[PDB]
Ligand binder design. Sequence first.
Ligand SMILES: [Zn+2]
Ligand SMILES: [Zn+2]
Length: 76
Amino acid sequence: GSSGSSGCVACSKPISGLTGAKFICFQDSQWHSECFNCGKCSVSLVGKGFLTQNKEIFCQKCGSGMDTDISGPSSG
Ligand SMILES: [Zn+2]
Ligand SMILES: [Zn+2]
């Protein structure tokens, strides 16, 4: 996206380019190590495998899309 610059999606600070910092590039957006985590709990996703549903980033346990039943997790 050559139209402008940006900062860490999680804090908007300007990333120190390729100066040697530890960063992640997901969907061309910028994330820092300390800012890469499960949206539902904040556990660091740096190391562990992450999940992506509804464009959101979650941990395995939280994103466990178990095909339990077609009723239960709804108003009933
Ligand atoms: Zn940050
Ligand atoms: Zn979680």
